[PDB]
Amino acid sequence: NGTVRVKNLLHSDDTKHMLDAVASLKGAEISTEDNGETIVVKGNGGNLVTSGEELYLGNAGTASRFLTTVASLVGKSQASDDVILTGNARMQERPIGPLVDALGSNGSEIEYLNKQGSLPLKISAGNGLKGGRIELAATISSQYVSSILMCAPYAKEPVTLALVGGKPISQLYIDMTCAMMKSFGIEVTKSTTEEYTYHIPKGTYKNPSEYSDASSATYPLAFAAMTGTSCTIPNIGSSSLQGDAKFAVDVLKPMGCKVEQTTTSTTVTGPPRGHLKPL
């Protein structure tokens, strides 16, 4: 719910497909401000309906996985009783069966248009998701877990998402999804007895009025150590879900650099040259 001005978006071909797909559903209104730098997203609290136009996703793998679950939330319209998700030849060969399986088990009606098991699919609209317990094999892509997590607050009953049959190998991306959900007002909790079962409350995100890559952000901060200047990265701090956000306090701080780290800002300051401390 509400209008959010999104800043510092990565503009690639894959995120553009996500933009135009999102804007394609009736209910989400996307525009650009500040000469294209800011993306303005006015959500309407999950009240999406079919536009009758298929969602072409190119070969945007992650987008196809996230939007397949979004599509399972969509309501019917005079345009169509279905949402169609398509892509290019390589998309129509990528497997998505683990996600389709889980959604089907939760009441979704999904048909593979041509290649069964490995292709962007079609979803019956007006069903929503039943909620309750949803199992996924722990061995699958974390993107399948993230995809279900983000739409789970919109199920008809609170969701328990249980990862079974082992341990996931990319837990950090599941944690990132969970942390971003919290910033948008929904807190995922974990089972006390199962490390990879997630309890997602039923509710609606509240969009902040405003909302980088920390690994590549290390190079301007590391530049500031070798002449002694000040460089600041304005969207990563201690609260950042990424793993390389600790780089200012863990390695640059014991090197003899004095750090203005807030929860969003990250500013380093170097000593004069020839005085850096060996760790």
Instruction: Write out the DSSP string of 62-111.
Output: HHHHHHHHHHTTPBP-SS-SEEEEE--TTGGGS--HHHHHHHHHTT--EE
Other C-beta atoms closer than 10 Å to the C-beta of 182 total: 12
190 with 198: CB under 8 angstroms? Answer: yes
Distance CA 83, CA 48 (A): 11
SS3 197: strand
* Phi/psi of residue 210, nearest 5 degrees: -130, 150
Distance CA 229, CA 196 (A): 44
Tokens found for residue 183: 């910033």
Amino acid at 218: T
Where does the chain break, by residue before each gap (C–N > 2.5 Å)? 211
Distance CA 234, CA 214 (A): 11
Amino acid at 87: G
SS3 234: coil
Other C-beta atoms closer than 10 Å to the C-beta of 33 total: 12
How is residue 7 annotated by DSSP? -
25 with 69: CB under 8 angstroms? Answer: no
Tokens found for residue 161: 């998402």
117 with 111: CB under 8 angstroms? Answer: no
Task: Give the 3-state secondary structure percentages of the chain, helix then strand then coil, rounded to 5.
Answer: 25, 20, 50
* Phi/psi of residue 32, nearest 5 degrees: -120, 135
CA dihedral defined by 58, 59, 61, 63, rounded to 10 degrees? -10
Closest CA to 94 of 70, 60, 122: 60
| C-alpha atoms less than 13 angstroms from C-alpha of 66 in its C-beta half-sphere | 16
Closest CA to 267 of 220, 198, 210, 200: 220
238 with 226: CB under 8 angstroms? Answer: no
